[PDB]
Design a protein around this nucleic acid. Structure first.
Length: 70
DNA sequence: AAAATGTGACTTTACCCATAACTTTGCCGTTACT
């Protein structure tokens, strides 16, 4: 898993700080839990690409993009 | 930091079909008058 990411970085020549951000994003829990708010149907979706639960604030705005990406 | 779910089961009008209990008419018989 780490070797393929390292080859990805080498192929795209991402800088040291860019690699640092990518590594931090890869290994970190989400910053904030999605809140219900007042007008958005929120929740979580199981993704087999990542293989985890991904949180969407809006089921008709962010969730379609999540479906595409999955 | 934020889009984007009202339903549907149980009531209430609303119009039509049927018939009672009278008014509303024409039509003809009768009669006062000319």
């Amino acid at each position: 898993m780490k070797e393929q990411f390292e080859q990805w970085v080498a192929r795209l020549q991402i800088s040291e700080a860019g690699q640092k951000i990518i590594e931090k994003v890869r290994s970190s829990e989400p910053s904030r839990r999605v809140g219900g708010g007042s007008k958005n149907v929120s929740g979580r979706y199981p993704s087999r690409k990542m293989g985890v639960t991904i949180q969407f604030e809006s089921h008709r705005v962010a969730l379609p993009i999540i479906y595409q990406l999955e």
